[PDB]
Every structure is written in C-alpha cells, then in structure tokens.
Design a binder for this molecule. Structure first.
Ligand SMILES: *[C@@H]1O[C@H](CO)[C@@H](O[C@@H]2O[C@H](CO)[C@@H](O)[C@H](O)[C@H]2NC(C)=O)[C@H](O)[C@H]1NC(C)=O
Ligand SMILES: Cc1ccc(-c2c(CN)c(CC(C)C)nc(C)c2C(=O)O)cc1
Ligand SMILES: *[C@@H]1O[C@H](CO)[C@@H](O)[C@H](O)[C@H]1NC(C)=O
Ligand SMILES: *[C@@H]1O[C@H](CO)[C@@H](O)[C@H](O)[C@H]1NC(C)=O
Lengths: 727, 74
C-alpha cells in the first residue's frame, strides 16, 4: 500500500549495504563489522579479531580514518578532518605501535597536515605540511624536510593546486613512492601568475564582516600553473645536509610551452614513467626514465618515447591512459583508441614504437584491473553489446584468442555491472555488483575461478522493499540516423502504457558521460516514480562515452551543440512512444547537466514546459582552463572564440519566455562560480522573463550540507509537482 | 652574452630554444669577444660546435662544445 517517499530518500530509510574491504596482504583483509575492526581470511576460511573502538576510546577524538603500515607494525590515525575541495582536505594524525597499541608520544606529526602516506613496503611516512614535503623514516624519529619553497596559494610541493586536483589527478597528493620505498617521486606546482577567483563567504551569523575567499583558478584562456617533477632518494637522507632532489624535465616537444603532467607510474625500483599533455590536449608524450646508479641521476631516452595523439579530438577519456608494467619493466599495457575509434588494450615493447592490440571490436575496455605473469584481468562493456554494463574479463597472455568472462554468467538477471578488488598478488578477488539487481558482494579464488562465499547480499534491504511500491527500470536503445543511442527510464509501479505519464528528463550529457546503465540506485528519481508517478528518463547522445570515439568526439570544439540537440530529440522519441503526456515534460540537471538543461530551455523547441538548472555553466570562458580547453580550444580570434560566443546561455535569454525556469546555485561554489548563474539571471532580467531562483549561502558545487541537501530536493519537488499540477 | 640554440617543431611550426642548451659567455676583466662574441662553427649533424673564446690564461683559443654540456674543452 505504500511508496518510496521524499523523506525515505532524504532520511535514508532504505540503506544499501556495502562490503568495503581493504587488503593488507595477498591472503587477508579488513572489515568494519559492528564498528570494531576485524581481520578476515580466504585461505582456510577463518576470520579472527584485530581492533575495536575501545582500543582508541580514551583517545578522546573520534577517528575519521585509519591506515596500517604495509608491514603491520604501525597504524596512522586521522582526525580533525576539515574538507577543502573535492579531494583535498586537512587533518591531524597520530601513530600507534600497532603491536602494543600505545601512541608514539614524541616527534608527532603536525596539525593542519595536507597529505600523508606510507611507503609501499616497510613503515616509511611521507607527509605534506605548509605546502612542503617531509619524510619520517621511523615514526618516533624526527622528520627530514625535503622542500623549503612551499608558499600558500603559490607553490605546492607534493600536493596539487585547484585545477590539478579537480581535473588532472582527481587527488590532492602529488607524491609517488617507488615499489620498494627507496625513491619518493613528486610534483611541484607554481600558481604565481594565475588569477584568483574571489567570492564572499558569510560564515556563522557571528561574523560581522563577510570573508572574501581568494583561489588561484585559471578560467578558459588565462595563465596556467607551471609544473616541475622531481625524485629524491629516501635512504641516503642525511641529518646535517639538506636533501637534494633530482629533476626530471619534460621532453622538448612539451617545453615549447604550456603543458601538463597527467600521469606518473613506477615500473621498477629504478624505472618511472611520466606522461605530458600539451595545453592543446590532442598531443601527449610518455617518457620512460631510468635511475643511473653511478650518477644519482635519472635518464629518459628519446627512443623510449611513445606518442599518443588524436586527429579527431582530445587524447583519453579525460586524460591519457595509465600504463601497467610487466615485472621486468621492459613491457607495458595501456588502453588507447584503436584504429577505428574504439578503446582497447595495446601491448608495448619499451624500446620500439609499434604497439599491437590484444582486443578489438565494437565495444570498449573500461580499465585494466590486474596483471600477473600468467594472465591479464580487465573490465569492459562487451557482454550483450551493452555500453552501460560492466563485466570482468581475463585474457591469456600466451594466447590472446583465449579470453574468459569471469563475471558475465554468474548472476545474469541480477548482475550486469561489476567492479573488482584484487589481493596484493591477485590470488583472490572481490566482485562488486552494483545492479541492475540489489548490489551483491562475493569473494573468489582466481587460481581456479571458483566462487568462495557471499560477503553481503543485501537481503535485509530486499526484505523491506517488498512492503514498498518500488519503481521499475527500463534500459534500451533507439536508432537515430542508423546509430544506436541508449536510454534509461525509471517507471512508476504498476506502469500501464495506455496512460499518459508526465516525464522528467534527467540530464548530464557531458563529454564522455553515461546516464544510461545497469546500476541500481535509490535517489530523487526513485521517489518521483514511486510516489508522484513521474517517469524519469536519461539519454546518452552524441558526446557520451564508452561507445567509440565517433560518438564521443562528435562534439569536439562544439560544446552546446549536438548534446543539446540530442536531449530534445530524446524527448520527442519518448513522446512518440505514446505513454508520455506531451503537455507535461520537464528537464533538469546539475553542473554540466545544468548547462545543458538551460540551453535546452533556451532552444525554443517548445517540447519542455519547465526545467531546473543547478550550478550550471553559463558560458565556457568562465570555467577552468584544463577541462574547458580540452573540448573547446582557446577562446581567441585565431582558435575557437566564435563558438565560445555562440554557445552561451545568456544569448538565448529571449526564449525562456516560453518556459518555467528554476535556477539554483551555491554562493561558495569554488568549481562552477556563482558568477555563471549571476550572469544567467541578469540576462533574463534584461530581456524581461520571469523565473524562479534560489541561492544557497556558503554551499559549494555539491550543495552537500545535510540541511541544504534536504532543502534543495524539497524545493525542486515543489517546483516539479506544481509544474505538473500534482496534488 | 647568451647563446640560444633553437630547433624547429615539425608538428606546431614554431621554434624552441631549450633553456638546457643555452650557453653563457662572460668576462670579469672586460667586454666579451674581440669586438663582439665569436661565431660558432657547427658539425654536420649540428650536435656540437667549435668557438674561439678566452681561456683561463686570457688567451683566445678554439673551444669544443657539445650542445648539452656547460663546459667545453680547448
Ligand atoms: C614560480 O614562477 C614565477 C614566475 O611565474 C617565478 O618568479 C620569478 O622568479 C625570478 C627568480 O627569483 C624573479 O627574478 C622574477 O622576477 C620572478 N617573476 C615573477 C613574475 O614573480 C618564481 O621564481 C617561481 N617559483 C618557483 C619555486 O618555481
Ligand atoms: C561544468 C562542470 C563541472 C564539474 C564537472 C565534473 C568534473 C570535471 N571538472 C569531474 C572530474 C572528471 C575527471 C570526471 N567530476 C565531476 C563529478 C564533475 C561534475 O560535478 O559533474 C564537469 C563539468
Ligand atoms: C594540535 O593543536 C592542539 C591545539 O592548539 C594542541 O593542543 C596539540 O598538541 C597539537 N598537536 C600536535 C600534533 O602538534
Ligand atoms: C636547507 O636549506 C634551507 C633553504 O634553502 C635553509 O634555510 C637551511 O639553512 C638549510 N637547512 C639545514 C638544516 O641545513
């Protein structure tokens, strides 16, 4: 008799269980059962105790996170967490002798520390504090300071600046240990001439004057951060004579000006691989560098260089692909765009440049997951030719024709979207199944591909969802101009197609995106279908990923065109299916999806009655260089300025007189600046179109505060119900 | 005085003087060169060159430069 309500979504009434584990070796792992930490085994099957909350109760502070040294002699405790950007944050840390569970009382790690990490083996500690790198050889000994040039908002040693964090590395750290822990590679960033985005921060009502936050942030075209790459030998670290870091420079063809470090990957104890991307992101280079023992130097040979370029677009999905190296270091595999657009695994000889593809066909490999001397494990969307499915494939390195799907046939109906987590030498592996059924977590022996045991099956959640009228999920395709274009639909319970349902188009449509897949979700859409009897739909048009460069590069230098068109055509196609109410079709999206929603509302197509845009881009000149330029080029008279000017939502203001528009934006959005939306509202004011608006004081791009998250979704519900005349 | 050595970039069409290949000439007793710095004579493969410069005795002599090293040899 009951439905999945807005409160159910906001108060998490029906929770998805996870089996988040972390491998400590090749035989055992950890799990948070209760909130006491337990060790687990797969070998003989048994699983004993290891830690608890009352090991660190009289501690005082609540632990945000922990981390075991590879050797298992030490545990690092993370508390005083203060979030910064999407990945960056600051924190305070304590180390215990995990053997004795007593805190290392002296030579403690400093407060406000910006990143910390163990070496891959032993118990070496590397942390960054005040933008400088430090090393602690034994947790109780004094640190050795590596760099002395760290300066706030200017020089970043071992950590990323704003744009390398969001766009290049998707991480705060710019530190990379060598496999045995002798060398610490790191990057240094210089934002000296990079302009600041400035915005107000209001804080608690106690703050009498608002604070102005100033972040180095290169918008399209602006001066970018420069970069340097170093390696230092963490064994011969003296105490009387400052550490000397050896610099590895970028190849010549990069230094001609404006480039990025986009990959760092070790090969052996004495071999590291770097990838550089020109600022025009259609040309990338990989340099392989050997440590010269009778020198203390790093040499990168010109012959060893390989080149990834693209004549039809940029290189990569969002970046050049990472290389996985065979144990000797003389060979590596990396996913690249194959001869005819599809992304597949190529086999590389270190010395010569002619690689050779080990997979082919009209599907893409998503990621290379594991490497042994025997086989190679990877994930892809081949099974049943479904771009939005994921399965685990194993390929025989001696015979490339002999491939095996390890996850495909396991639970066909329930499970079409897998991810995997291997043990430290790949003798065991966990399978995450994220849908279409209820997520299922299962442990396997890779030695004989036999399934060991069910870790978590969500039978608790399964139990209560029978008391609830839940929405169904349709995944299918439509043929446009002789091409397969995929869509998904969240359909009300008891869906009957002799009725005319109101339809909300849920859009992102960004370059290389996918909103049509086999993943089970419980979200705002679940509530709209379940309670409000609304169909929620998404569609992957030209520009979306995982279906070949043809489709993805289709909007190169041409944001705001074919991905905007195709969303409109998606609606038409859905209405043409005969179970949609033509007078009640809405469109909504967040971030890039905000931009597209707005362009669609500005397009005058007359299909959409109303729409919601949340933190949208309004014109591409306002957004950060790394992301924007990759798709647009430079906004200069001799490159792509014309299109920059042709693709703003401001220019389309007049057309919003045909729709109901809700524009929402957080005032502390470091990513997509309130500016972008301020320019939208001003344009609409200046042509005289009424619209709803909502700012969120001090919320960033996530609008992720508990109370704000609740507030916005409640607000958007009201808007859609009312637009749809729902009672 | 600073000598730059600049290569042509095929793929862009622009020229690149690598800071690594720059060579500095200077004097702490007078001006540089006889009436100006000396002209370089490159080997056929242009990876090395010869040049008249003042040696540690004040005498001008033919120094042999590689394109990637700071120090030549006389
Ligand atoms: C970061 O880059 C800036 C240039 O953008 C460097 O600043 C220059 O440094 C030199 C040498 O000290 C000065 O003579 C120049 O006047 C500086 N120019 C500017 C614009 O500030 C700075 O040295 C770099 N820092 C590091 C550690 O790489
Ligand atoms: C205008 C705009 C704003 C943000 C993004 C975005 C990006 C890129 N900054 C990335 C980094 C990529 C590596 C996925 N992640 C996410 C989740 C988002 C997003 O919030 O959608 C893309 C466009
Ligand atoms: C961190 O800061 C607090 C408060 O000022 C102080 O009492 C504590 O000793 C500091 N801890 C470290 C690791 O220096
Ligand atoms: C190391 O170099 C720094 C900065 O260049 C200097 O201030 C300091 O004297 C040196 N440190 C030690 C411990 O010798």
């Amino acid at each position: 008799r009951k439905t999945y309500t807005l409160t159910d979504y906001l108060k998490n009434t029906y929770r998805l269980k996870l089996y988040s584990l972390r491998w400590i070796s090749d035989h055992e792992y950890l799990y948070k059962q209760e909130n006491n930490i337990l060790v687990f085994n797969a070998e003989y099957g048994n699983s004993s105790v290891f830690l608890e909350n009352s090991t660190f109760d009289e501690f005082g502070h609540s632990i945000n996170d922990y981390s075991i040294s590879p050797d298992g002699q030490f545990i690092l405790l993370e508390y005083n967490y203060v979030k910064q950007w999407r990945h960056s944050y600051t924190a305070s840390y304590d180390i215990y002798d995990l053997n004795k569970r007593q805190l290392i009382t002296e030579e403690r790690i400093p407060n406000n520390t910006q990143w910390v990490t163990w070496s891959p083996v032993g118990h070496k500690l590397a942390y960054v504090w005040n933008n400088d790198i430090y090393v602690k050889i034994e947790p109780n000994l004094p640190s050795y300071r590596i760099t002395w040039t760290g300066k706030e908002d200017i020089i970043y040693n071992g950590i990323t600046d704003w744009v390398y964090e969001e766009e290049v590395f998707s991480a705060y750290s710019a530190l990379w240990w060598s496999p045995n822990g002798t060398f610490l590679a790191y990057a240094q960033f210089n934002d000296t001439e990079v302009p600041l985005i400035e915005y107000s921060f209001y804080s608690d009502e106690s703050l009498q004057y608002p604070k102005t936050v100033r972040v180095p942030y290169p918008k399209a075209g602006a001066v970018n951060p420069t970069v340097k790459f170093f390696v230092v030998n963490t064994d011969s670290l003296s105490s009387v004579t400052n550490a000397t870091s050896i610099q590895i420079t970028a190849p010549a063809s990069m230094l001609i000006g404006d480039h990025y470090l986009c990959d760092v990957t070790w090969a052996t104890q004495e071999r590291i691989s770097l990838q550089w991307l020109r600022r025009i992101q259609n040309y990338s280079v990989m340099d392989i560098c050997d440590y010269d023992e009778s020198s203390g130097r790093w040499n990168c040979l010109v012959a060893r260089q390989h080149i990834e370029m693209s004549t039809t677009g940029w290189v990569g999905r969002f970046r050049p692909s990472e290389p996985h190296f065979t144990l000797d270091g003389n060979s590596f595999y990396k996913i690249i765009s194959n001869e005819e657009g599809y992304r597949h695994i190529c086999y590389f000889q270190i010395d010569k440049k002619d690689c050779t593809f080990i997979t082919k066909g009209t599907w893409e490999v998503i990621g290379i997951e594991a490497l042994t001397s025997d086989y190679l494990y990877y994930i892809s969307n081949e099974y049943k030719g479904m771009p939005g499915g994921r399965n685990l494939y194993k390929i025989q390195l001696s015979d490339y024709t002999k491939v095996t799907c390890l996850s495909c046939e396991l639970n066909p109906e329930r499970c079409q979207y897998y991810s995997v987590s291997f043990s430290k030498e790949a003798k065991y592996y966990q399978l995450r199944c994220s849908g279409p059924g209820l997520p299922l977590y299962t442990l396997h022996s890779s030695v004989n591909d036999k399934g060991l045991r069910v870790l978590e099956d969500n039978s608790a959640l399964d139990k209560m969802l029978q008391n609830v009228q839940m929405p169904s999920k349709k995944l299918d395709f439509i043929i446009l101009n002789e091409t397969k274009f995929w869509y998904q639909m969240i359909l009300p319970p008891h869906f009957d197609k002799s009725k005319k349902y109101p339809l909300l188009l849920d859009v992102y449509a960004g370059p290389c995106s996918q909103k049509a897949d086999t993943v089970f979700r419980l979200n705002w859409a679940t509530y709209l279908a379940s309670t409000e009897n609304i169909i929620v739909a998404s569609f992957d048009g030209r520009g979306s990923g995982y279906q070949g460069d043809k489709i993805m590069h289709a909007i190169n230098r041409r944001l705001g065109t074919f991905e905007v068109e195709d969303q409109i055509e998606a609606a038409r196609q859905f209405s043409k299916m005969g179970f949609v109410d033509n007078k009640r079709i809405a469109i909504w999206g967040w971030s890039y999806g905000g931009y597209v929603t707005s362009m669609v509302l500005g397009s005058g197509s007359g299909v959409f009655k109303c729409g919601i845009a949340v933190a949208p881009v309004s014109r591409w000149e306002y957004y950060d260089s790394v992301y924007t330029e990759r798709y647009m080029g430079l906004p200069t008279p001799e490159d792509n300025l014309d299109h920059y000017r042709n693709s703003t939502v401001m220019s389309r203001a007049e057309n919003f007189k045909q729709v109901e528009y809700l524009l929402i934006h957080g005032t502390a959005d470091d990513n997509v600046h309130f500016q972008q939306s301020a320019q939208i509202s001003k344009a609409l004011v200046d042509v005289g179109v009424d619209f709803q608006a909502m700012w969120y004081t001090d919320e960033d791009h996530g609008i992720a505060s508990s109370t704000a998250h609740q507030h916005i979704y409640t607000h958007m519900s009201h808007f859609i119900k009312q637009c749809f005349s729902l009672p």
